Amino acid sequence: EYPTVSEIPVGEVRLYQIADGVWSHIATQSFDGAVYPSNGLIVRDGDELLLIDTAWGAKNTAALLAEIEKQIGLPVTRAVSTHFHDDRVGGVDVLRAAGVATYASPSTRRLAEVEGNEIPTHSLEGLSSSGDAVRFGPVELFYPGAAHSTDNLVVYVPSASVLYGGCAIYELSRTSAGNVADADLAEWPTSIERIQQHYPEAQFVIPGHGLPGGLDLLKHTTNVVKAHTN
Numbered sequence: 001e002y003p004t005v006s007e008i009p010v011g012e013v014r015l016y017q018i019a020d021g022v023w024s025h026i027a028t029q030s031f032d033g034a035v036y037p038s039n040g041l042i043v044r045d046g047d048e049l050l051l052i053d054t055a056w057g058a059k060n061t062a063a064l065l066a067e068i069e070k071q072i073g074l075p076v077t078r079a080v081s082t083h084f085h086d087d088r089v090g091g092v093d094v095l096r097a098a099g100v101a102t103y104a105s106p107s108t109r110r111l112a113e114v115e116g117n118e119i120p121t122h123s124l125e126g127l128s129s130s131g132d133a134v135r136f137g138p139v140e141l142f143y144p145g146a147a148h149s150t151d152n153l154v155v156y157v158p159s160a161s162v163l164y165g166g167c168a169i170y171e172l173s174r175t176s177a178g179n180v181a182d183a184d185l186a187e188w189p190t191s192i193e194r195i196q197q198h199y200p201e202a203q204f205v206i207p208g209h210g211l212p213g214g215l216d217l218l219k220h221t222t223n224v225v226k227a228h229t230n
């Protein structure tokens with residue numbers, strides 16, 4: 001049903017429709033010689049589209065654009081990157097050049113600049129304190145606290161009870177810690193519990209990499225992070 005790493009060639013993107021006017025996008029990328037899948041979101045807002053995350057590099061993000069055009073055929077006008085790493089902002093220049101207004105928090109923009117990663121143009125205000133939520137069209141954006149990265153946002157689509165966790169939330173397949181050099185391991189579980197307290201109504205939970213699940217992915221992630229800590 002949900003597209004899998006093993007069914008997606010590196011360079012192609014697939015869409016999965018989760019509800020009316022809500023899709024995930026799935027791509028794959030090589031990292032240290034393994035192949036990973038990676039998810040983002042697409043959310044309809046009237047006659048245009050809001051994109052959440054790039055598809056992890058220029059080539060994948062151009063493909064995502066063409067796949068959106070062929071399967072949905074609405075224009076992407078805005079995009080939000082959920083943190084500063086390349087699976088979230090790699091492709092921002094491609095988006096900018098297609099006339100998409102690219103957004104991320106000041107924090108994310110700062111960290112991307114330092115890192116040498118592509119920098120979203122626009123700044124999302126009101127997200128600097130743990131627990132902050134802002135409305136961004138047909139979604140709510142939430143800063144739960146440091147976890148996978150200090151700047152990690154999550155995204156909730158109230159219309160469809162879809163919570164998009166990005167890299168702060170692990171799929172059930174991942175049973176040891178992923179890529180954590182920029183992580184706040186000590187605060188990651190407190191951050192997830194903020195997510196649980198703010199979106200206890202979420203039905204469909206999407207991790208940054210892999211298959212979606214329910215609110216159990218939050219508990220799963222907490223288990224994996226505490227086991228890594230120990």
Ligand SMILES: NCCN[C@H]1CC[C@H](CC(=O)N[C@H]2Cc3cccc(C(=O)O)c3O[B-]2(O)O)CC1
Pocket residue numbers: 031036085086087088115167177178179180181182208209
């Ligand atoms: N100061 C640190 C040096 N800069 C470092 C900044 C991060 C980059 C690595 C990187 O690009 N990682 C992304 C791609 C990736 C790959 C595997 C698992 C995950 C996961 O989500 O678990 C994943 O997602 B990420 O967002 O983390 C290395 C240099």
Ligand SMILES: [Zn+2]
Pocket residue numbers: 083085148149167
């Ligand atoms: Zn990351």
Ligand SMILES: [Zn+2]
Pocket residue numbers: 101102121122
């Ligand atoms: Zn603009």
Ligand SMILES: [Zn+2]
Pocket residue numbers: 087167208209
């Ligand atoms: Zn990631």
